[PDB]
Design a protein around this ligand. Structure first.
Ligand SMILES: [Mg+2]
Ligand SMILES: [Mg+2]
Ligand SMILES: [Mg+2]
Ligand SMILES: [Mg+2]
Ligand SMILES: [Mg+2]
Ligand SMILES: [Mg+2]
Ligand SMILES: [Mg+2]
Ligand SMILES: [Mg+2]
Ligand SMILES: [Mg+2]
Ligand SMILES: [Mg+2]
Ligand SMILES: [Mg+2]
Ligand SMILES: [Mg+2]
Ligand SMILES: [Mg+2]
Ligand SMILES: [Mg+2]
Ligand SMILES: [Mg+2]
Ligand SMILES: [Mg+2]
Ligand SMILES: [Mg+2]
Ligand SMILES: [Mg+2]
Ligand SMILES: [Mg+2]
Ligand SMILES: [Mg+2]
Ligand SMILES: [Mg+2]
Ligand SMILES: [Mg+2]
Ligand SMILES: [Mg+2]
Ligand SMILES: [Mg+2]
Ligand SMILES: [Mg+2]
Ligand SMILES: [Mg+2]
Ligand SMILES: [Mg+2]
Ligand SMILES: [Mg+2]
Ligand SMILES: [Mg+2]
Ligand SMILES: [Mg+2]
Ligand SMILES: [Mg+2]
Ligand SMILES: [Mg+2]
Ligand SMILES: [Mg+2]
Ligand SMILES: [Mg+2]
Ligand SMILES: [Mg+2]
Ligand SMILES: [Mg+2]
Ligand SMILES: [Mg+2]
Ligand SMILES: [Mg+2]
Ligand SMILES: [Mg+2]
Ligand SMILES: [Mg+2]
Ligand SMILES: [Mg+2]
Ligand SMILES: [Mg+2]
Ligand SMILES: [Mg+2]
Ligand SMILES: [Mg+2]
Ligand SMILES: [Mg+2]
Ligand SMILES: [Mg+2]
Ligand SMILES: [Mg+2]
Ligand SMILES: [Mg+2]
Ligand SMILES: [Mg+2]
Ligand SMILES: [Mg+2]
Ligand SMILES: [Mg+2]
Ligand SMILES: [Mg+2]
Ligand SMILES: [Mg+2]
Ligand SMILES: [Mg+2]
Ligand SMILES: [Mg+2]
Ligand SMILES: [Mg+2]
Ligand SMILES: [Mg+2]
Ligand SMILES: [Mg+2]
Ligand SMILES: [Mg+2]
Ligand SMILES: [Mg+2]
Lengths: 101, 138, 113, 59, 117, 154
RNA sequence: CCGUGAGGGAAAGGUGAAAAGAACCCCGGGAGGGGAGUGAAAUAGAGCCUGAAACCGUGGGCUUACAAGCAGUCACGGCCCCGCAAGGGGUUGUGGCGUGCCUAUUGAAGCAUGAGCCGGCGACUCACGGUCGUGGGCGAGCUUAAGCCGUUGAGGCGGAGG
RNA sequence: GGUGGAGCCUGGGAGUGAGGGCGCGAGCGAUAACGUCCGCGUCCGAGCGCGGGAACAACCGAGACCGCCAGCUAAGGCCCC
RNA sequence: GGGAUGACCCCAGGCGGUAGGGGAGCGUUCCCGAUGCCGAUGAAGGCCGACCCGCGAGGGCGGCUGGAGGUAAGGGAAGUG
């Protein structure tokens, strides 16, 4: 098919059997989440309004991971000001199942 | 995140008649065309705009008293080496320069921009030398 | 295989000899013999000396035939400098370094059976 | 210790880049026509002796 | 008891030297120069890990425009249409449709200019 | 810097040499120089409230008694300093080196016999101190030593 | 070593368990090497344990002669390298953004100070008083100093005194 | 009215006692000065962190805990750069 | 506020920063712990790492080098970065 869902503040182009990681969903690997949040379809379901109130895509949560570390270094000249922090964005990897529209 | 990357695509040519167009107003469009910001394939770091053959340069329109009053400057590193050439003289001789200079000063300035200019062929016109297709535009 | 030589602590500045050693790198033994034979530099003498020793090794020690031989590798590394005083004007004493080089030449064979 | 001095240490690149020309050029030789030997052109080498040309020793 | 430097300084030094691999000249061979180059990078990355977001708000917009321009309207209008046609979704990121689904896109335009005509 | 074997002579003139300003190669600086706030001899001993020492001595014992790991004695069959002998009486008493034992008694003969045992720490009754009671697992005093202990607790 | 002199005043430690310290052969005037041989190890071969960094080289991978820069960073792309894959490592062609560090100043990229680079040494301590705070002990009270007896990494006593 | 990194009381530790630009009200000056001296305010100082102003401490916008290949705005902009 | 004191949970605000104040931690030398425990099936140090933990200082584990020392939890001192 092909759809456009809204999850974790962002919105992705999902499809049949695949998926990357989205924000951190408070679900559990041993579960299935539904992103009722959905717009557009392969055959044009353009949510004439916010959402397509009726359709939805189903995705099974593979699990949760912790992104690659990013480093945030703050430095301010002529002031002995330095700060080093390590960062890891929690993620929940999904697997798209089907688009019920 | 979705990809975008268009990947190596054959460039299209474009023929333009400047007959009575006013440069500056024409020049701008040759620029957007030169960098191809008119196509959803737009990619900043790659030359992927159209090639642009401009014919009938010279005989180009310009308003006000820009003839005699618009001056082109050129500086040799020598003392008192600043030359002032009024528009009329540039058209009278080296007329394609008027349209090239104009367009040039409207392209990004680094290596790429420098390269897109090599993608712009101007002639005193009419008729040009490129039979590699040539969709005419307005 | 290959046959190594090396002449440690020669007492000629490296930069100076790297200069003649680069002339022979890759050439054949025979051809490299003629080069530093007519190369107008103090270095040649040393290089030739180590070059000829590697040749004498490749045959006697690892039997390789004086023919196939060619300088596969050759480079000259820097050895401990000899610090010396040089009386300058107005009392000033300067330290002139009499450098020293470790010349190394390694040989190999060209064609086969 | 006097007047002009270099402003900055010349970087390794800049130093080496200058010596792009210090590369030595091979001696020019040719085969001697009288004997099997290499020697510089227009010169009398020991090996042969030059069809008489005041040569070294030989019996 | 005497507590000499010992090994603690070589380690801190070679730590930084590693984050400097790849840098030009002394900016990768000497702790002082490297230490300095890093301060800057630390900052650019942070500074840039933001411009990025804007660098694409950018990209997408140049495209969405270029694309809907072949349909008779400009970026301004299009966005107004959508935003007004309530289909406030698209999301510059996903209006990449212009490249993949030129029809699913076009439909979106019609809807846009319709929301204004 | 005032105790190194160097002269206090100013090394180079104050001004115009192109060198840093220095005086005598005896100040903190300069490798062979002197040490800044280095250690000096000093007495680390302070007077601890006797009442606190008493309390602790008892507490140390009490605590050992609570685990039933205390064990006072009347006498020792294997007397007459001779490890073999103590090792003997040891079995009888329940000590086999499984636990470290603090054996305090005024009998030099017994003392002599234990002592060399890797698991035995030996003391004269009037030497009963907290540190030892704690560094050992089991405490073994004789009745004559349990008294001196008493004459010291309140 | 310096200074006429009083006087000043360095640097420099480590083969291996054992010299078993490399016979002899080969290139060389020697030095030095290559073999052989000793040894568990010879990149323990002799100012020889380990042997970092600056610095100098040889070989390879990516990449550069229309570009312009506090040398990096963000983004794509090419080539090379890992792993089955997803993914990752090296390099850098374009694009975007970018005014070294320290110090001192109202204000510094600053054409103000300091630093050639690296390694090692290098600066808020200790004693006794004082004043708060705090962890405990005892509290109409608390506490000993010198010294004495004991140990020989055992603690007691000692009320002068505060 | 007002629950605020408001106030008040007691005590421990400070640092600071070269300030600067802008606006407004005065003096000085020659209603000259990136001048000088006070008054309120505000920024810089310590926000040489971010956007705008071509560039630019103090002008306009706005107070940066970290992440996002999402969204709405501010000043300023919307012909090309 | 939960309070089953679960120091983990939802709720509510806040989190630019020089001089400075305050609070937590990392690492170095040495002492108790040690007549212990690691160690030639390799100590300390060195050279690598795209892996694991931590906000960070670091702590791991792995390969190479090295060839005889090292030293937990838990505390104690100080020539400690
Ligand atoms: Mg700066
Ligand atoms: Mg400042
Ligand atoms: Mg002279
Ligand atoms: Mg003289
Ligand atoms: Mg010199
Ligand atoms: Mg070089
Ligand atoms: Mg946007
Ligand atoms: Mg936007
Ligand atoms: Mg003396
Ligand atoms: Mg003195
Ligand atoms: Mg004197
Ligand atoms: Mg000087
Ligand atoms: Mg000393
Ligand atoms: Mg003298
Ligand atoms: Mg052997
Ligand atoms: Mg060894
Ligand atoms: Mg040894
Ligand atoms: Mg060694
Ligand atoms: Mg090295
Ligand atoms: Mg190379
Ligand atoms: Mg050009
Ligand atoms: Mg080129
Ligand atoms: Mg760049
Ligand atoms: Mg100053
Ligand atoms: Mg200040
Ligand atoms: Mg400068
Ligand atoms: Mg300067
Ligand atoms: Mg000054
Ligand atoms: Mg300074
Ligand atoms: Mg200088
Ligand atoms: Mg240094
Ligand atoms: Mg150092
Ligand atoms: Mg005190
Ligand atoms: Mg005090
Ligand atoms: Mg306050
Ligand atoms: Mg106060
Ligand atoms: Mg004042
Ligand atoms: Mg003033
Ligand atoms: Mg003043
Ligand atoms: Mg003020
Ligand atoms: Mg004032
Ligand atoms: Mg003010
Ligand atoms: Mg005024
Ligand atoms: Mg002023
Ligand atoms: Mg004024
Ligand atoms: Mg004043
Ligand atoms: Mg402020
Ligand atoms: Mg500002
Ligand atoms: Mg600035
Ligand atoms: Mg600004
Ligand atoms: Mg600006
Ligand atoms: Mg804030
Ligand atoms: Mg908007
Ligand atoms: Mg507005
Ligand atoms: Mg803060
Ligand atoms: Mg020590
Ligand atoms: Mg011990
Ligand atoms: Mg073994
Ligand atoms: Mg140690
Ligand atoms: Mg110190």
């Amino acid at each position: 098919m092909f759809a456009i869902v809204k999850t974790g503040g962002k919105q992705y182009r999902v499809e049949p059997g695949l998926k990357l990681r989205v924000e951190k969903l408070d679900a559990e690997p041993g579960a299935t989440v539904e992103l009722p949040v959905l717009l557009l379809g392969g055959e044009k379901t353009v949510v004439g309004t916010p959402v397509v109130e009726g359709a939805s895509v189903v995705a099974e949560v593979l699990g949760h991971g912790r992104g690659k570390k990013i480093l945030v270094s703050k430095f301010k000249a002529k002031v002995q000001y330095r700060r080093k922090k390590g960062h890891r964005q929690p993620y929940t990897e999904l697997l798209i199942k089907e688009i019920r529209g | 995140m979705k990809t975008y990357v268009p990947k190596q695509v054959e460039p299209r040519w474009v023929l333009i008649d400047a007959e009575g167009k006013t440069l500056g107003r024409l020049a701008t469009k040759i620029a957007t065309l030169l960098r191809g910001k008119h196509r959803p394939d737009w990619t900043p770091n790659v030359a992927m705009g159209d090639f642009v053959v401009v014919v009938n340069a010279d005989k180009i329109r310009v308003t006000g008293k820009k003839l005699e009053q618009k001056i082109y400057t050129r500086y040799s590193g020598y003392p008192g080496g600043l030359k002032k050439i009024p528009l009329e003289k540039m058209l009278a001789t080296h007329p394609e320069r008027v349209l090239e200079h104009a367009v040039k000063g409207m392209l990004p300035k680094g290596p790429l921009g420098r390269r897109l200019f090599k993608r712009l062929k101007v002639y005193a016109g009419p008729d040009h030398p490129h039979q590699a297709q040539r969709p005419e535009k307005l | 295989m290959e046959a190594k030589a090396i002449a440690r602590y020669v007492r000629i500045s490296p930069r100076k000899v790297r200069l003649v050693v680069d002339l022979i790198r890759g050439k054949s033994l025979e051809e490299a013999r003629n080069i530093l034979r007519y190369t107008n530099k103090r270095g040649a003498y040393f290089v030739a000396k180590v070059l000829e020793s590697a040749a004498a090794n490749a045959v006697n020690n690892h039997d390789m035939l004086e023919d196939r031989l060619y300088v596969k590798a050759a480079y000259v590394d820097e050895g401990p400098a000899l610090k010396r005083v040089l009386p300058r004007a107005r009392g000033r004493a300067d330290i002139i370094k009499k450098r020293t080089s470790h010349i190394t030449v390694i040989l190999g064979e060209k064609h086969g059976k | 210790a006097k007047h002009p001095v270099p402003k900055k240490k010349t970087s390794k690149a800049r130093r080496d880049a200058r010596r792009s020309h210090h590369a030595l050029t091979p001696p020019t030789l040719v085969p001697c026509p009288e004997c099997k030997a290499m020697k510089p052109p227009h010169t009398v080498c020991p090996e042969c002796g030059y069809y008489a040309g005041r040569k070294v020793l030989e019996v | 008891p005497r507590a000499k430097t010992g090994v603690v300084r070589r380690r801190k030094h070679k730590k930084i030297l590693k984050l400097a691999k790849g840098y030009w000249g002394l900016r990768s061979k000497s702790f002082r120069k490297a230490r300095e180059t890093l301060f800057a990078a630390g900052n650019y990355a942070y500074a840039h890990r933001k411009r990025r977001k804007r660098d694409f708000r950018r990209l997408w917009i140049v495209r969405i425009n270029a694309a809907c321009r072949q349909h008779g309207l400009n970026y301004s209008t299009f966005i107004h249409g959508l935003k007004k046609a309530g289909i406030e979704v698209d999301r510059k990121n996903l209006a990449d449709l212009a490249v993949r689904e030129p029809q699913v896109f076009a439909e979106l335009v019609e809807r846009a200019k319709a929301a204004q005509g | 810097r005032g105790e190194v074997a160097y002269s206090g002579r100013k090394i180079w003139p104050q001004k115009h040499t192109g060198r840093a300003r220095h005086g005598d190669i005896g100040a903190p600086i300069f490798v062979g120089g002197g040490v800044v706030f280095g250690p000096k001899p000093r007495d680390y001993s302070y007077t601890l409230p006797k009442k606190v020492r008493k309390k602790g001595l008892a507490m140390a014992v009490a605590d050992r008694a609570r685990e039933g790991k205390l064990l006072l004695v009347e006498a020792f069959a294997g007397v007459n300093g001779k490890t073999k002998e103590f090792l003997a009486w040891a079995k009888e008493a329940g000590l086999d080196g499984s636990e470290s034992v603090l054996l305090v008694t005024g009998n030099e003969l017994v003392r002599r016999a234990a002592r060399n045992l890797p698991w035995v720490v030996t003391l004269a009754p009037e030497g009963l101190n907290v540190y030892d009671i704690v560094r050992t697992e089991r405490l073994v005093m004789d009745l004559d030593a349990w008294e001196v202990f008493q004459n010291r607790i309140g």
